[PDB]
Design a protein around this ligand. Structure first.
Ligand SMILES: COc1ccc(NC(=O)CN(C)C(=O)C2(c3ccccc3)CCCC2)cc1
Ligand SMILES: [Zn+2]
Ligand SMILES: [Zn+2]
Length: 482
């Protein structure tokens, strides 16, 4: 026992009385359902654990609840039975939804007054609902959402100690060494975060946190020319068989309410100077993703721009001549790089996404980082299908197979950006591209599949700030302990 029964009763009874006072919405919930009198003889075939307000009151009054989650559980048992048994359009269903809304408001400040994280009954997103897990304070015995208190067994193996118990004993929580800042740095990561933090300091907005950019994957790969064009151009001995590239994964994190938040992810393909044409000295953005919790809101878009402009600046200086972006929005539900985006984070329509890349590239011109950029139509004109750069997982390889030319580039022109970084003479007499960062092997971050799979297995959602904080903590433990 943590509480005197009278203490628990005096704290919770007012939240019960809040529900009882709601009339008519409490009328179906005041007494045990009597299926005979109500003419619903199938009630007990569907509802196996009936619960009502008079029962909960008698449990409070007789000291039956040992800790308040038991009370919250009986409340949500009572709501769930009504939502299970009654139609969505029914009066009782709608009354039950009203009481759940009044309960949500009342329980929170009460559960926080008794030293709990919150009073919420929490389930994961559909991907039947998996319940959120609880951890137990080793000092006081209170149970709390694992996600509310960000308790990870690998970071803190001796167990969870709540803020209230730590303050009581004049201790602070042992530092999280599995942080984004303590991930191994790269010249690329440093260059990007230095550009982002220089920009944020110049803005001098009080809400902004430090930003971290970490390259977390770097491996050498090859894209093989698919059979239906190997037959035409490769087998003859005209086009090269396979194009070697470096695949890199990077993430940007922000300090929000004292902890790491992963808010941006990018995969790139880097076809260097020892790469046969038409891929020679090109970079390709495989995929971009974000989680909209960057603070402040008013700088979110600029920060994304600073990372992307930063990346183009950096590869230019190494000797890449051209950047390529397939400006195509995702369509994998609430997933892409990040599992389970916030439900109010809208995927942009093709037009808005094109206007967003356009805006980013106009700033890059103003800075003399991008010399010029155009749609693949106007750059194919200004330059056979053998001469198009051939990138792993891109639209263009797949569409030339559907055929086996100029027809297709016109109808889908605005979705393909070609970005001249080094144009004209300067491009001709360049040193070899040498990447000064080591290879970073990491199977979890090798393409976007493996991390989506882990996030599905382990309910690493990005659907709210609190869940995105827990998922950021969990991904960083994985990245440090590989
Ligand atoms: C509801 O489920 C979702 C939600 C979002 C995504 N992903 C994107 O929006 C992925 N994207 C297109 C983005 O992040 C940018 C974006 C977003 C919005 C406007 C303009 C640009 C911001 C960083 C790069 C591009 C996927 C599923
Ligand atoms: Zn909680
Ligand atoms: Zn405690």
């Amino acid at each position: 026992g943590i509480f005197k029964p009278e203490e628990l009763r005096q704290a919770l009874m007012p939240t019960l009385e809040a529900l009882y006072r709601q009339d008519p919405e409490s009328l179906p919930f005041r007494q045990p359902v009597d299926p005979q009198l109500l003419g619903i003889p199938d009630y007990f075939d569907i509802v196996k654990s009936p619960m009502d307000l008079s029962t909960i009151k008698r449990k409070l009054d007789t000291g039956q609840y040992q800790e308040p989650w038991q009370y919250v559980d009986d409340i949500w048992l009572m709501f769930n039975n009504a939502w299970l048994y009654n139609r969505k359009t029914s009066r009782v269903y709608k009354y039950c939804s009203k009481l759940s809304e009044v309960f949500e408001q009342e329980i929170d400040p009460v559960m926080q007054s008794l030293g709990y994280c919150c009073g919420r009954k929490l389930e994961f997103s559909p991907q039947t609902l998996d319940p959120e897990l609880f951890v137990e304070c080793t000092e006081c015995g209170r149970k709390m959402h694992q996600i509310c208190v960000l308790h990870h067994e690998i970071i803190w193996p001796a167990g969870f100690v709540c803020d209230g118990c730590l303050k009581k004993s004049a201790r602070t929580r042992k530092e999280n060494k599995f942080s984004a800042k303590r991930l191994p740095s790269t010249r690329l990561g440093t260059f990007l975060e230095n550009r982002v933090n220089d920009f944020l300091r110049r803005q001098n907005h009080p809400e902004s946190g430090e930003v971290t950019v970490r390259v977390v994957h770097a491996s050498d790969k090859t894209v093989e020319v698919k059979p239906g064009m190997k037959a035409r151009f490769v087998d003859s001995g005209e086009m090269a068989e396979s194009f070697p590239y470096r695949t890199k994964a990077l993430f940007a994190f922000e300090e929000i309410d004292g902890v790491d938040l992963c808010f941006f992810g990018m995969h790139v393909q880097e076809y260097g100077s020892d790469c046969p044409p038409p891929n020679q000295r090109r970079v390709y953005i495989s995929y971009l993703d974000s989680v909209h919790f960057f603070r402040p809101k008013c700088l979110r878009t600029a920060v994304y721009h600073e990372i992307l402009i930063g990346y183009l600046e950096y590869v230019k200086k190494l000797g890449y001549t051209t950047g390529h972006i397939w400006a195509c929005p995702p369509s994998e539900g609430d997933d892409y790089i990040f599992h389970c985006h916030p439900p109010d984070q809208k995927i942009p329509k093709p037009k808005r996404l094109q206007e967003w890349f356009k805006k980013m590239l106009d700033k890059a011109v103003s800075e003399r980082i991008v010399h010029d950029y155009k749609d693949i139509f106007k750059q194919a004109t200004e330059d056979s299908a053998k001469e198009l750069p051939y990138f792993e997982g891109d639209f263009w390889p797949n569409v030339l197979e559907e055929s086996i030319l100029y027809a297709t580039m016109e109808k889908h022109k605005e979705v393909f950006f070609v970005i001249r970084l080094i144009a004209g003479p300067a491009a001709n007499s360049l040193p070899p591209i040498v990447d000064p960062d080591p290879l970073i092997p990491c199977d979890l971050m090798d393409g976007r599949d493996a991390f989506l799979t882990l996030a599905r297995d382990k309910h690493l959602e990005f659907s709210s700030l609190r869940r995105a904080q827990w998922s950021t903590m969990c991904m960083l433990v994985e990245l440090h302990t590989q």
